[PDB]
Amino acid sequence: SICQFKLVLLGESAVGKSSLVLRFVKGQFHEYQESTIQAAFLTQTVCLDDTTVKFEIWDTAGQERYHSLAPMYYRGAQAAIVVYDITNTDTFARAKNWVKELQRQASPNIVIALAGNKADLASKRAVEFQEAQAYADDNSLLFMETSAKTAMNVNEIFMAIAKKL
Ligand SMILES: Nc1nc2c(ncn2[C@@H]2O[C@H](COP(=O)(O)OP(=O)(O)NP(=O)(O)O)[C@@H](O)[C@H]2O)c(=O)[nH]1
Ligand SMILES: [Mg+2]
């Protein structure tokens, strides 16, 4: 059996979208990753209990000037990962508005995950785990804290999404 899933990453600029995709797909992390100006397309293939799973992944430009283009990438998506930065409350608020947009405008069957990224920066935390967990539970979102830098929960969040599709 082979399954293929269409996935999109959304979120404020600098939260770590490209770093997360790069860690999952290439096992790489770049401390000096440049801001995305044009959406990038990547694939990874994994094994999941009796199935070979291929991911098709859109890594969007997070800056607000590219907002109007986002539906090109999420309208056909089966799953989305909305990413925020645990060290910045404003990015968590922005993530909630991405979630709201998906709920109103993307497929009614979309699986929405929420990633609290940069969790390795524990001494710089702004958003408490419990607050994000409660928001996720209330809105039916698949929530994990992640680190592209250390790889913490990077494999885990993509695999959890695949299990639910
Ligand atoms: N400490 C730490 N730094 C991280 C982590 N993930 C990304 N970064 C760093 O944060 C910066 C921004 O990451 P990047 O992936 O470019 O963010 P982005 O969400 O793709 N930005 P844009 O939307 O503008 O393309 C980079 O310097 C990157 O190395 C993480 O988990 N921990
Ligand atoms: Mg990027």
UniProtKB/Swiss-Prot annotation:
Binding site for Mg(2+): S18, T36
Activity regulation statement: Regulated by guanine nucleotide exchange factors (GEFs) which promote the exchange of bound GDP for free GTP. Regulated by GTPase activating proteins (GAPs) which increase the GTP hydrolysis activity. Inhibited by GDP dissociation inhibitors (GDIs).
Superkingdom: Eukaryota
Oxidoreductase in keyword set: no
Post-translational modification: Phosphorylation of Ser-68 in the switch II region by LRRK2 prevents the association of RAB regulatory proteins, including CHM, CHML and RAB GDP dissociation inhibitors GDI1 and GDI2.
EC numbers, comma separated: 3.6.5.2
Positions bound to GTP: 13-14, 16-19, 30-31, 36, 62, 117-118, 120, 148-149
GO biological process, any: regulation of endocytosis
Membrane topology: Lipid-anchor
Modified residues (Phosphoserine): S68
Predominant location: membrane
Swiss-Prot/TrEMBL cofactor(s): Mg(2+)
Localization per record: Cell membrane; Early endosome membrane; Melanosome
GO terms under cellular component: early endosome membrane; endocytic vesicle; lipid droplet; melanosome; plasma membrane
Top enzyme category: hydrolase
Cysteine pairs bridged by disulfides in the record: none
Intervals of motif Switch 1: 28-40
Reactions catalysed according to its record: GTP + H2O = GDP + phosphate + H(+)
Record's keyword terms, sorted: Cell membrane, Endosome, GTP-binding, Hydrolase, Lipoprotein, Magnesium, Membrane, Metal-binding, Nucleotide-binding, Phosphoprotein, Prenylation, Protein transport, Transport
Residue positions of motif Switch 2: 61-77
Domain topic, free-text comment: Switch 1, switch 2 and the interswitch regions are characteristic of Rab GTPases and mediate the interactions with Rab downstream effectors. The switch regions undergo conformational changes upon nucleotide binding which drive interaction with specific sets of effector proteins, with most effectors only binding to GTP-bound Rab.
Subunit and partners: Interacts with EEA1 and INCA1. Interacts with GDI1, GDI2, CHML and CHM; phosphorylation at Ser-68 disrupts this interaction.
Family: Belongs to the small GTPase superfamily. Rab family.
Protein role: The small GTPases Rab are key regulators of intracellular membrane trafficking, from the formation of transport vesicles to their fusion with membranes. Rabs cycle between an inactive GDP-bound form and an active GTP-bound form that is able to recruit to membranes different sets of downstream effectors directly responsible for vesicle formation, movement, tethering and fusion.
Protein's UniProt name: Ras-related protein Rab-5C
Residue range from the parent sequence: 19 to 182 of 216
